[PDB]
Amino acid sequence: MQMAKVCGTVVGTQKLPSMTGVKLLLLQFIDANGELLPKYEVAADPVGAGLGEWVLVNRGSAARQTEYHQNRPLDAMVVAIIDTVTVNNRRLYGE
Amino acid sequence: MQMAKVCGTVVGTQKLPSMTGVKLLLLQFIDANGELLPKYEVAADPVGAGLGEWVLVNRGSAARQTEYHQNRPLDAMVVAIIDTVTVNNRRLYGE
Amino acid sequence: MQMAKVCGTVVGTQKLPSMTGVKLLLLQFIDANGELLPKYEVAADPVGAGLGEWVLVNRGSAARQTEYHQNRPLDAMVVAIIDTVTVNNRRLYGE
Amino acid sequence: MQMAKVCGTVVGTQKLPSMTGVKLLLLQFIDANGELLPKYEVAADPVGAGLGEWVLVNRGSAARQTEYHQNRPLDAMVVAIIDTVTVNNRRLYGE
Amino acid sequence: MQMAKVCGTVVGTQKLPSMTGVKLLLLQFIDANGELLPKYEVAADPVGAGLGEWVLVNRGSAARQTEYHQNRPLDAMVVAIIDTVTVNNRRLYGE
Amino acid sequence: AVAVGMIETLGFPAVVEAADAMVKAARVTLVGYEKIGTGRVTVIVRGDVSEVQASVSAGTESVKRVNGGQVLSTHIIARPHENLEYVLPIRYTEEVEQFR
Amino acid sequence: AVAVGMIETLGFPAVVEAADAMVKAARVTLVGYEKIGTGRVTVIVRGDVSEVQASVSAGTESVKRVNGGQVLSTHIIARPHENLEYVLPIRYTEEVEQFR
Amino acid sequence: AVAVGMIETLGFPAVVEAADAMVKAARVTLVGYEKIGTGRVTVIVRGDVSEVQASVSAGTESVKRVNGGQVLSTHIIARPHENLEYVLPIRYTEEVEQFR
Amino acid sequence: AVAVGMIETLGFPAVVEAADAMVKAARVTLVGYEKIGTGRVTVIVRGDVSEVQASVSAGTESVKRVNGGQVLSTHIIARPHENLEYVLPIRYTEEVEQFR
Amino acid sequence: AVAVGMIETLGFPAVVEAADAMVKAARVTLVGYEKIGTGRVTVIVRGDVSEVQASVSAGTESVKRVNGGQVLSTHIIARPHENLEYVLPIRYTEEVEQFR
Amino acid sequence: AVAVGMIETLGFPAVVEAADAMVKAARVTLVGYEKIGTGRVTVIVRGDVSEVQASVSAGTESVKRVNGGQVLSTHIIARPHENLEYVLPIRYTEEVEQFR
Amino acid sequence: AVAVGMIETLGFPAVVEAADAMVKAARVTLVGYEKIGTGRVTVIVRGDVSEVQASVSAGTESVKRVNGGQVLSTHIIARPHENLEYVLPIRYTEEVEQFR
Amino acid sequence: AVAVGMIETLGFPAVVEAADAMVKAARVTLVGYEKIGTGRVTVIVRGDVSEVQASVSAGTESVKRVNGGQVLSTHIIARPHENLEYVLPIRYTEEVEQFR
């Protein structure tokens, strides 16, 4: 998994029939401190993530293990909306 | 998925028998802003993508999940032709 | 596998139902010399890893091979807590 | 898939029994312009690729999808010998 | 596959029960010339590799294809001990 | 002397998918559009035979992703006679010389 | 950098029809003629690998016009090694450098 | 550019009945005699395809009146490529220029 | 005293796929090409047995991807006697001294 | 006071695969090689018990990748008595002190 | 940096034929001879792993010429550890340093 | 007064393994190599009749290492007649008088 | 370079009958006596291969006329490598030089 920030959304009209109904986000990866990296990922989103949320995104065949993404061509998915990150036994993303 | 711009096509005559009929594009990756990265990917193309189009390309085992690419040696595929990218609640690739 | 150091833990309240009960760490990758890289990974943790401990983390579909992580969307897991690294026939992480 | 140039050959005699009969090449990756990158890959070669050829190489589990590479530990394969690359509607690797 | 040099070993005492009996090396990746890169990988070793020896290491799900690594959480494995590399029809790792 | 590829479908939306995926797959030029009756429509491409073989083969499984559209017939001719240009409607017209 | 394509037929009338329909199909040149015994006769064409696959695919299906003529094995090699030119009879001879 | 007819029989007395009934049934010229192994012998004639078509078809029905001799394969090529004469043994030799 | 690898196939297009995938899979030199009848063709390579073992084993699995061509026999001799080069046709000829 | 690991195989090539995959898996010192009859051969390693537990476990899964080689018995002793080194042949010799 | 190969056979005439056909087949040096009991006799060859793999493959199939001689276990180790030379009897002795 | 021994194998990789294991086994010299058709290849060794029987018995059982290689007929002649030296290809040639 | 014959029996009175009938049948010299365990005893003869082949064959049916004695294994090596003399116990000792 990777911590990422939801910058926006991507809409594709001409797509595969397996890709219909799949909400495609635009995540930007953040580092361990929390600063935005120059690396992004368009990921599927089963758990509803809003703009600016910190999410956990997994890459590869793990995005197709949730019984509605099984036969879909997905290589990225939002598995968790991050509640808190505690680094060096102190809070980092409490809010 | 990654957003990518269709730069051109790759034609291979001597290839595997499983690779016949597979349209191989030449996609250059773009960043979150929309500038071309120095990273490319030759990807299969089930949805017909023309030159200059922005597409979503996925890598790995997800390129073999669409009922005609199942037993093919593909590690990249165009799953969607991008209609609109909306970054920070404002339009980026409307057109 | 990759050697990594447990910097902290990541807690996500809103997540997939398959991701319940999965302990999510925050590992920072170390090099072969032992110094922390600017590359991280949020990994599952079946073997209990404490803060500051050096672990062995594997990426990809190998994180879903351990009898309870099978149908979970995991692309990283802690497979071993590192006891000794012996580079060039001399001890590096004995302790 | 990635465009790569066949730089050389790698031969190993002490290997797994599943790796017997597998021709291991030494490919150097080329960019979209067509010059060599400082990234390489040792790939299996079902279609006969000579030294100096431009080939299409795929990484991952897609190298194990070709009716005899199924139970072999391969993470790279040459799927096509590149005949023509046409970037921006003009020829690049015609020959 | 990637060419890599066996720098050392990694011993892990607290690990998964699937990871018992798996010999974990510490490989450093080499380039096409033969100089050590600042990239490493802890890989399983069915083919017995000694320190300093050049090996072929594959990443991903291909490390789980050899009849005893099948249900093990391995994402790297040594598939071959390199006997010779011949780049541009001249020998490079003959010995 | 330039290679001719033909994809014959049953239906017009099937043959526009055939014609569009052919000129997109490789550097070929669609020069022809032929109706012979009973719902059989043929599109004709021209180009080097590396391009025409790749486009016709990729054009065949693009009609297979259209509902109700089949490929009735397909063929590639690598070096036709110059007699075929004047009788058959496979030649370059004036409108399609910019894509040559 | 020219490919080599071979069609092995069972019979000499089957292999002249294979040789005639290979040089008529695409821009390849017939350079070779090899008998290995037991009525297995091979012809060898040289050209670009797009022209060679268009010839060998045409010459394979052209041997069904010959009654009693069978196709045994065909193969197309994209670029043969320089070692193969001097050992195997696949190289360009001086009888066929006017057709290159 | 002169038509080639070939009759392949299993056996030498069948192939001389082939070769003689070919040159008698029409104005053709026997130019070739080819052994490819396993008892397969080919007879090659040249001439106008008015002659060679009647020559081959009457030459095929004459092998059927030999005991133990049969025709394995037969073929007529009406307009061969000029590449075929230099590689395949179907060309006019010097001895048979009086019968052209 | 240099290792000899041999791949014997049934057919000539299978044996050029043998001969080319042998010289590409390792630094070996194709020195021989032997016909012994009944469609059996042998390809002989030379080199260090690090190369020739990988050359033969990868050359054997390439003939299996040819239609109608199979491998009848294959063998590697790591250290032949010096008597073998003068009698058997396995020695370095003059044409293939640039690939040694 | 230094841990003893013992892998007993049936056969000598099985026990050299045992002895080498032990000293390669972790920093252990192979000090012993013991024959007790009926083809039972034991190799003895010494080192810290983090190294010996990893080496003996990795050394056990290497003998079963040998044809005809089995593992008869396997044991690791974490802290032996000082009585054991003078009687049993498990002690560090003078030859193997450089690997201690 | 020289590999070690072992062939364990049941019987002394089986182990001399295995030892003779190993040093004849490739450029290896027979350095060892180890009896472990119950009629299990092992020979040990040394060389680089190219020649050692070709020796053990030749010496294994060479013990079928010996009636009543069986091959029990064979193994090739590509580079033994420096620890194994002093403990296990696989090192080069001074009697066989003229054959290295 | 030197014997002649022959081993006829089916295949050229089977007959080089037969020839290599015959001159390695005893003090004989390989002088001959004769193809008679249908893939029947014979090698001929010369020596004293004790050395020839030790070679032919070794070379016969050596062709089981060659997969797909069969031994068809072997024979040992104690002293051939002087008539056989000039008619049959069993005599000593000048390539192999350095091995006598 | 001198031929080695070995007869391996199950039992010591069977192997003295093997050793005595070997040196009596032909001019060979018994140089070896080898125990490898489980009641397997080997005797080793040396001499010219005319003598060794006759002695080993006559020595095999002499063990068959002993009650409770079998021949487990037997072999003749016509020209061994000189590497075999120093490792294996088949060489001429100082005591048995008068019978050389």
Phi-psi region of C21 (alpha: psi -120 to 50; beta: other; left: phi over 0): left
Q: Are L15 and L7 in contact (CB under 8 A)?
A: yes
The DSSP element (H or E) to which I51 belongs, if any, is: helix I49-63
Residue K70, token pair as written in the block: 């069986």
Interface I–L counts its CB contacts (< 8 A) at 88
Half-sphere exposure of D40 (CA within 13 A, CB side): 24
Strands (E), A1-95: 2-15, 24-30, 36-41, 54-59, 76-81, 84-87, 90-91
Question: How many Cβ atoms from other residues are within 10 Å of residue K96's Cβ?
Answer: 17
For residue D29, the cross-strand partners are: D4
CB–CB contacts below 8 A, C to J:
11
G4 shares contact with chain I (CB less than 8 Å): yes
What's phi and psi for M8, nearest 5 deg? -105, 120
Q: Which of H8, H97, H12, H94 is nearest to H44 (CA)?
A: H8
Coil, helix or strand for E64?
helix
CA distances from K31 to A48, E47, E51, K97, M82 (A): 71, 24, 24, 9, 12
Helix (H) or strand (E) holding L62: helix L49-62
* K25's tokens: 């087949």
Give the number of other CB atoms < 10 A from CB of residue L81. Answer: 9
Q: Which residues contact G70 (CB under 8 A, 6 or more apart)?
A: G9, G10, G11, G14, G63
Residue B7 distance to chain F (closest CA, Å): 12
Greatest alpha-carbon pair distance for chain D in Å reads 47
Which position has the token pair 């019968």?
H99
Tokens of I22: 């042998």
* Technique used by the depositors: cryo-EM
Compute the distance between CA of residue F65 and CA of residue F43 in angstroms, rounded to an integer: 18
DSSP C53: -
CA H90 – CA H74 distance, rounded (Å)? 15
* Residue F52 CB contacts under 8 Å (≥ 6 apart), including other chains: F3, F4, F5, F26, F28, F45, F46, F76, F78
Question: Chains contacting A with at least 3 CB pairs below 8 Å?
Answer: B, C
Helix (H) or strand (E) holding M22: helix M12-25
Buried b (16+ CB within 10 A) or exposed e, D6-25: bbbbbbbbbbbebbebbbbb
Report the SS3 class of residue I14.
helix
- Give, as one character, the DSSP assignment of residue A35: P
Q: From chain C, pick out residues whose CB is under 8 angstroms from the CB of E50.
A: none
Q: At what angle do helices L12-25 and L49-62 cross, to 10 degrees?
A: 140
- C26 contacts on A by Cβ (under 8 Å): 32, 85, 87
Alpha-carbon distance of B31 to B85, in angstroms, equals 12
Tokens of D47: 């279609």
Cβ <8 Å between A60 and B56: no
Amino acid at M10: L
How distant, in Å, are the alpha carbons of C27, I35, M51, M77 from that of M26? 80, 46, 5, 16
Determine the residue type at E19: M
φ and ψ at K87, to 5 degrees?
-100, -55
- Alpha-carbon gap, residue A33 to C38, rounded angstroms: 10
Question: Is residue A43 left, alpha or beta, with left meaning phi > 0 and alpha meaning psi from -120 to 50?
Answer: beta
Q: Per the structure block, which two tokens stand in for C64?
A: 């879903």
Nearest CA in chain J to K86: J95
Using alpha carbons, list the distances in angstroms from residue K60 to C8, J18, J83, K15, M85.
57, 21, 44, 10, 21
Q: Which of C15, C33, C32 is nearest to C24 (CA)?
A: C15
* Cross-chain residue pair J20–K72, CB shorter than 8 Å: no
Distance CA F79, CA G51 (A): 9
* CA atoms of J8 and J14, how far apart (whole Å): 9
Instruction: Write a three-state SS string for F85-98.
Output: HHHCCCCCCCCCCC
Name residue, tokens 């209609």.
Answer: B83
- For residue F27, give both structure tokens: 């550097």
Q: Please report, in angstroms and rounded to a whole number, the separation of the first and last CA atoms in chain F.
A: 14
CB < 8 Å to H73, chain G: 11-14, 66-69
Residues of E in Cβ contact (< 8 Å) with D59: 60
Which amino acid makes up residue D83?
A: D
Looking at the DSSP bridge assignments, the partners of residue K77 are K4
Euclidean distance between CA atoms E34 and E38, whole angstroms = 13
Asked if I50's CB is within 8 angstroms of E89's CB, the reply is no
CA distances from F60 to B21, F12, F69, F73, L98 (A): 7, 15, 11, 10, 68
CA distances from F6 to F26, F63, J48 (A): 14, 13, 75
Distance separating alpha carbons of residues C43 and C34, to the nearest angstrom: 19
CB contact under 8 A, J26 and C86: yes
- E44 within 8 A of E24, measured Cβ to Cβ: yes
Q: Chain D residue with minimal CA distance to E90? A: D8
Cα J49 from chain centre: 13
C-beta atoms of G1 and D53 within 8 A: no
* Min Cα separation K39/chain J (Å): 8
Please give the distance of CA I70 from its chain centroid, rounded to a whole number: 15
Contact L36, L42 (CB under 8 A): yes
In whole angstroms, how far apart are CA L28 and each of C45, E53, K24? 71, 43, 16
* Closest CB to K27 among I53, I76, I79: I79
Check if the beta carbon of residue E61 is closer than 8 Å to that of residue D73: no
CA-based nearest residue to C7, from E26, A92, E40, E16: A92
Those residues with Cβ within 8 angstroms of residue D9's Cβ, 6 or more apart along the chain or in another chain:
D24, D25, D26, D51, E85, E86, E87, I24, I25, I26, I27
- The residue behind tokens 């190219």 is K50
G67 contacts on H by Cβ (under 8 Å):
73-74
User: And the tokens for B7?
Assistant: 């730069």
Residues 6+ apart with CB under 8 A from I49: I3, I76, I78, I79, K26, K50, K51, K54
Contact (CB, 8 A) for E79 and D73: yes
Query: What are the start-end ranges of the E strands in F11-80?
Result: 29-35, 40-47, 71-77
Residues 6+ apart with CB under 8 A from J55: J5, J21, J22, J23, J25, J26, J28, J45, J47
What is the CB neighbour count within 10 angstroms for residue G65?
14
F25 touches chain B (CB under 8 A): yes
Q: K12 Cβ partners below 8 Å, 6+ apart?
A: K41, M6, M8, M34, M36, M40, M42, M73
